[PDB]
Amino acid sequence: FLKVKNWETEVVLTDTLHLKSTLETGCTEYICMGSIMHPSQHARRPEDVATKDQLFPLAKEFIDQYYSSIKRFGSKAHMERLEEVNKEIDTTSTYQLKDTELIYGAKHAWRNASRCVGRIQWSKLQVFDARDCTTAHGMFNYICNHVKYATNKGNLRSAITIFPQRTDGKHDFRVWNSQLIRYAGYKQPDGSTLGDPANVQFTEICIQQGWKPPRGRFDVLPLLLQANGNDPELFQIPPELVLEVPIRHPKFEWFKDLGLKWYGLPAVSNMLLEIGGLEFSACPFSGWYMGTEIGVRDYCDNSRYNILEEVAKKMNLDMRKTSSLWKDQALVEINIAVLYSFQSDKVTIVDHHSATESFIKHMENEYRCRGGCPADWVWIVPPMSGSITPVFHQEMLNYRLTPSFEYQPDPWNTHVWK
Amino acid sequence: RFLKVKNWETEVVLTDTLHLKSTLETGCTEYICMGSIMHPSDVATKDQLFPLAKEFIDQYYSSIKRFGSKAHMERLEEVNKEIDTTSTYQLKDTELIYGAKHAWRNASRCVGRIQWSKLQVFDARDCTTAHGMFNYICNHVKYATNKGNLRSAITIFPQRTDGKHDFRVWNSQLIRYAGYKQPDGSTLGDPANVQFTEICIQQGWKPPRGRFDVLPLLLQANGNDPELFQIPPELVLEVPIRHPKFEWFKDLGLKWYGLPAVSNMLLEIGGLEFSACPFSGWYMGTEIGVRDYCDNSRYNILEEVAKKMNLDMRKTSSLWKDQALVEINIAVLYSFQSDKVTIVDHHSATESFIKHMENEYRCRGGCPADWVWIVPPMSGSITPVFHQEMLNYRLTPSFEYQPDPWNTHVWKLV
Numbered sequence A: 001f002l003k004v005k006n007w008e009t010e011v012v013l014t015d016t017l018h019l020k021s022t023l024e025t026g027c028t029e030y031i032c033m034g035s036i037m038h039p040s041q042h043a044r045r046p047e048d049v050a051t052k053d054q055l056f057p058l059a060k061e062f063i064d065q066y067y068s069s070i071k072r073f074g075s076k077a078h079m080e081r082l083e084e085v086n087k088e089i090d091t092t093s094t095y096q097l098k099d100t101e102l103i104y105g106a107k108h109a110w111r112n113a114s115r116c117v118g119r120i121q122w123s124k125l126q127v128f129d130a131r132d133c134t135t136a137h138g139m140f141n142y143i144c145n146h147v148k149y150a151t152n153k154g155n156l157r158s159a160i161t162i163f164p165q166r167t168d169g170k171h172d173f174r175v176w177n178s179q180l181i182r183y184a185g186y187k188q189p190d191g192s193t194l195g196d197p198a199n200v201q202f203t204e205i206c207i208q209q210g211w212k213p214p215r216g217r218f219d220v221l222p223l224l225l226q227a228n229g230n231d232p233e234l235f236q237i238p239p240e241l242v243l244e245v246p247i248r249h250p251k252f253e254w255f256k257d258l259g260l261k262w263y264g265l266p267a268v269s270n271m272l273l274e275i276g277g278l279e280f281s282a283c284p285f286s287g288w289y290m291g292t293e294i295g296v297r298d299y300c301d302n303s304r305y306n307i308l309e310e311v312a313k314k315m316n317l318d319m320r321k322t323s324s325l326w327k328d329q330a331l332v333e334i335n336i337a338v339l340y341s342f343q344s345d346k347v348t349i350v351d352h353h354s355a356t357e358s359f360i361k362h363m364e365n366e367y368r369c370r371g372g373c374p375a376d377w378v379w380i381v382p383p384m385s386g387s388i389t390p391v392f393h394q395e396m397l398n399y400r401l402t403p404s405f406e407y408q409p410d411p412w413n414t415h416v417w418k
Numbered sequence B: 001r002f003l004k005v006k007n008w009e010t011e012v013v014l015t016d017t018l019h020l021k022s023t024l025e026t027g028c029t030e031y032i033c034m035g036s037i038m039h040p041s042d043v044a045t046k047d048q049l050f051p052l053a054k055e056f057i058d059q060y061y062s063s064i065k066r067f068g069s070k071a072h073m074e075r076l077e078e079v080n081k082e083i084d085t086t087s088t089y090q091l092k093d094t095e096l097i098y099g100a101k102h103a104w105r106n107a108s109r110c111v112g113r114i115q116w117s118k119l120q121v122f123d124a125r126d127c128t129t130a131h132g133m134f135n136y137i138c139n140h141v142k143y144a145t146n147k148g149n150l151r152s153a154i155t156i157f158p159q160r161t162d163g164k165h166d167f168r169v170w171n172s173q174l175i176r177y178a179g180y181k182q183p184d185g186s187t188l189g190d191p192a193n194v195q196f197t198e199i200c201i202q203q204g205w206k207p208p209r210g211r212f213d214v215l216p217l218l219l220q221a222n223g224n225d226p227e228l229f230q231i232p233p234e235l236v237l238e239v240p241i242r243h244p245k246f247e248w249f250k251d252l253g254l255k256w257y258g259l260p261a262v263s264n265m266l267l268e269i270g271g272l273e274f275s276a277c278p279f280s281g282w283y284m285g286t287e288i289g290v291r292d293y294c295d296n297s298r299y300n301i302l303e304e305v306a307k308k309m310n311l312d313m314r315k316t317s318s319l320w321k322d323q324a325l326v327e328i329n330i331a332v333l334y335s336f337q338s339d340k341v342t343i344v345d346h347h348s349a350t351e352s353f354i355k356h357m358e359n360e361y362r363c364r365g366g367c368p369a370d371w372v373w374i375v376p377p378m379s380g381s382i383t384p385v386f387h388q389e390m391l392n393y394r395l396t397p398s399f400e401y402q403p404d405p406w407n408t409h410v411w412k413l414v
């Protein structure tokens, strides 16, 4: 057992759930890597098709956990299912998840996402089974429906769409986009950058793939879909499905004249979903934004939109030195605008005070019913106003549970074309 | 066997070989990370003290490029002679200064480490009484405060012997305001220090029962009962907090002290334990302005400032707390600069610390850092340490925590 204390309320939780931890965190008792982006390459099976003694033990574990979840350990259906995975693996070197197993594993991957502040909602995920897809066109149909359903005219709903699992590796389904909706980034001739600088390499892949770019600041990027390992394919998301919020300020009338907007749907599309030894290399999932993701990081990182110096000018701020806190002060007004805009257009959005409060409650709930909750303090603490949110003063144990979401290399580094 | 760290903003990559040296446990395991735990997990005999001593002397003579030398080998023999016959040994003045400087340098949670080498070390190992401790500490303060041009300093008192004759400063910092719990449940002054205020009052302190009463020193020498001493007012530099734009801000009546002086930590060198070792530098703005003034368990002036800003304090998505918080830290920096009291803001400090980190990688092979503590408690993302990965390990000499003296001391009067 390992206790965790809240240094603001003195609540102490007692974690036993960590004992079911399978993968290495990256830490040793002599060195802590809690601030490394990807601390560990400890996967669960070799990079392409594993052998029977490699795959079944992972499969046996998940099926065990799922039947144990529904209070049917060792039942008729449980024992039959193991034997069924046994024969599938025998004759296909893989196995196929039942519909309910798919939904259980997808929801529980979200649940063990040690980095997601927005997990109090985990069991309310909508799972779209796309395991029957065969082409990039079909991938585009599935994604498009995802976006309509999730967006819900602004009343956002969490959803994941799950494309066929990895087989041998040279037949992967991928979304080459990192998120379903991102603006483009163009390397200007004078060395500067128009649009979103994180997406310059991807914006150039799209150009070199055929995309006519409008060469602006908020060009929604094309989807770039790969099916069954083949060459990826450009599709344009119908604009009427890309709900966008223009950013204005509840006080500074001049703010709208900055011509800033952002998209209302955050949909991570480049990660890998891992259930019982199976690897779903294409599993786009979406929810709704915490304000700070847009207004702190997207707008105010140096390597991102860097609107800070611009907004500070209009604020008439002494930018001669740092000790004036002109960056701090504009950062707040920006994140004030971003919130007030989304709420004004009735687009779902949550502020960092409301969401962190929820996660404290979610930790309670979890510790009380599950015996723990994995939590990555470095990522949970919002990137502005850290200590005036509850999460800051909350001790967090971090450990890796399966099912889970895993990083994976960008498909263009590992894809020989045709 | 190297370990790399990346800055996801600049994309600089640093190679850490220093982590091999460490031998003290972080608290993590291979399957759980304890990087957000505030505190993870009588005194040492002869046999534990030999290697620790050897370790330290070895690393010291290496730093002065004299490893293997006659002076190195004779020192070791001398150190063993002492432990062999008194179960302890005594650091040289050179080693004491080296050790103290490196304990700071090795403080993975300190962002201000770029100045580690400029420490002024005051040896107080000859002290024997609480009055002696008060004298030494008063000199510390006058020196460190330096009429506002603050200077880093440490004062090191006699080492632990049997855990029964221990010097301690009961004070957690050398200058802290007092806090009193009122009948009605309201709290006057600093609520952090309420329990310590009660300990003092009980021991004879006659409190002014105001909002900013400098507490007294509660000084323990040689394991005896501690003793009360009032720092001379003329040595406590204080800053009245005003705001460059908001005229009304002075009326809040806030002030803060100028000298941050940590006193309840243990300094560990060569297996020796220095249980009283107050140290001091200057302040980063956020330590007063975010945590001292705006934590809920503390002075909690957020409510009061936002009223005097006419902010909408109903819903949270108005970000009134964020907005007031910036202003309070604008005020705490402006106030110090005007009175020409040394202070660094969180932008400048993080900036410097990245430079420090990079230099420490070059010359030394790494630098242990605790991203949880290095990232400031406001505007984290727009400081460069946010985008900087950091390896964390425990190098000795180090500053450790120790239990609060009032939990473990056994009294003697009447």
Ligand code: HEM
Pocket (backbone or CB within 6 Å): A110, A113, A114, A115, A116, A117, A118, A119, A121, A125, A158, A159, A160, A285, A286, A287, A288, A289, A290, A293, A350, A355, A379, A405
């Ligand atoms: C519904 C509202 C949600 C909110 C407000 C939210 C918020 C966040 C935030 C702030 C992060 C930190 C990373 C960053 O700042 O970019 C994060 C990480 C993450 N979230 Fe959520 N999220 C939500 C829903 C979801 C859903 C629906 C899923 C999957 C079904 C998910 C899975 C993840 C994963 C995998 C990570 C990162 C883990 C890693 O990098 O190892 N989140 N989330």
Ligand code: HEM
Pocket (backbone or CB within 6 Å): B104, B107, B109, B110, B111, B112, B113, B115, B119, B152, B153, B154, B279, B280, B281, B282, B283, B284, B287, B344, B349, B373, B399
């Ligand atoms: C000179 C200017 C200095 C600045 C601006 C500075 C700043 C900081 C800050 C912000 C922290 C985080 C702790 C908190 O916020 O509560 C810290 C921690 C720390 N400082 Fe420094 N500091 C300075 C000098 C020193 C000196 C002179 C020493 C000792 C010789 C020292 C030893 C430490 C230690 C040991 C910690 C870590 C506490 C722990 O591990 O729990 N610092 N410092």
Ligand SMILES: Cc1cc(N)nc(COc2cc(CCN(C)C)cc(F)c2F)c1
Pocket (backbone or CB within 6 Å): A266, A267, A268, A271, A285, A286, A287, A288, A289, A290, A293
């Ligand atoms: C569903 C959802 C909702 C929401 N409101 N926010 C998010 C943020 O999702 C992620 C963001 C990053 C950025 C990491 N950086 C290296 C680019 C990495 C991940 F693994 C994520 F899952 C997701």
Ligand SMILES: Cc1cc(N)nc(COc2cc(CCN(C)C)cc(F)c2F)c1
Pocket (backbone or CB within 6 Å): B260, B261, B262, B265, B279, B280, B281, B282, B283, B284, B287
């Ligand atoms: C010399 C110096 C300068 C400076 N500007 N700041 C500091 C802050 O050092 C510490 C602060 C805390 C606060 C931890 N909280 C529970 C109250 C605990 C420690 F052990 C520290 F060493 C020191």
Ligand SMILES: C[C@H](O)[C@H](O)[C@H]1CNc2nc(N)[nH]c(=O)c2N1
Pocket (backbone or CB within 6 Å): A035, A036, A037, A378, A379, A380, B008, B386, B387, B388, B389, B390
């Ligand atoms: C170096 C550091 O680990 C890195 O910048 C992390 C810090 N914490 C984060 N927290 C969130 N929510 N998102 C991030 O991308 C990061 N980046």
Ligand SMILES: C[C@H](O)[C@H](O)[C@H]1CNc2nc(N)[nH]c(=O)c2N1
Pocket (backbone or CB within 6 Å): A007, A392, A393, A394, A395, A396, B036, B037, B038, B372, B373, B374
């Ligand atoms: C629970 C968590 O570890 C705790 O609130 C820490 C986080 N980081 C911190 N960082 C600093 N500088 N000071 C602190 O007191 C803390 N508190």
Ligand SMILES: [Zn+2]
Pocket (backbone or CB within 6 Å): A027, A031, A032, A033, A034, B028, B032, B033, B034, B035
């Ligand atoms: Zn760790």
